[PDB]
Design brief:
Two copies of one chain form a homodimer. Chain A has a five-stranded antiparallel β-sheet, with helices on one face. The first copy, chain A, has one domain: Yope Regulator, Chain: A (2-Layer Sandwich), CATH 3.30.1460. With 120 residues, chain A is of the alpha+beta class. The radius of gyration of chain A is 15 Å and the shape is globular. In chain A, 26% of the residues lie in helices and 30% in strands. In chain A, strand 2 and strand 3 form a beta hairpin. At the A-B interface, strand 3, strand 4 and strand 5 of A face strand 4, strand 5 and strand 6 of B. It is classed as chaperone. The entry lists the keywords type III secretion, yersinia, chaperone, yopt.
Chain lengths: 120, 116
């Protein structure tokens, strides 16, 4: 209801611009080091994605730490973080809290404290 | 709240009927069911809002890259207690019996492949 309508509100609330291609993928930069991409698949599945870079420790990838979960995947020899949920009943307050949780998690995983050694 | 949790219970009641299949529920409201006596899927709800499937994969498996896009919602391979598990979740809201049933079949089919 509908993905576009939701993204349009989202940007407003966060005061960001920001790019969207003819492919309906939305981009926004955070402090110019983080970039999150958002898209909707099958008219239902809202999908977040961000690159984390090289040399991240592995994550066990369990559910229960964030709702919805943030999963650490491997793409092209580097680590990424992604998260998805159904658009049905997703509102602006929740979309925003979610992107905020996602962004905070990316930030912490990129900090030196999250060392390859594990930490450790 | 109470209504969301009742919605989860309602869906489980529908699913077990549709599956015409023995369910167990424990004290924590975890539903279980075996398929052909070696595959066991557990279903629980969190915060009256999220349906979570879980299955043990039974070995410490070849890592999956854990990307999204292959199933909706994704099936994720986690590591728990030194072994691999498969899991998948989605919001309870707007989830009906036919989607629930299809999701469960996709998830079981994937577990089968990964145990092979």
């Amino acid at each position: 209801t509908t993905f576009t309508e939701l993204m349009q509100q989202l940007f407003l609330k966060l005061g960001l611009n920001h790019q969207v291609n003819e492919n309906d993928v939305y981009t926004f930069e955070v402090d110019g080091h983080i970039q999150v991409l958002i898209a909707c698949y099958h008219q239902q599945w809202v999908q977040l994605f961000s690159e984390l870079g090289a040399d991240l420790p592995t994550n066990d990838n369990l559910f229960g730490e964030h709702w919805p979960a943030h999963v650490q995947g491997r793409l092209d020899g580097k680590s990424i973080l992604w998260s998805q949920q159904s658009l049905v009943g997703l509102d602006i307050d929740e979309m925003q809290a979610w992107l905020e949780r996602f962004i905070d998690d990316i930030e912490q995983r990129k900090e030196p404290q999250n060392t390859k050694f594990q930490p450790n």
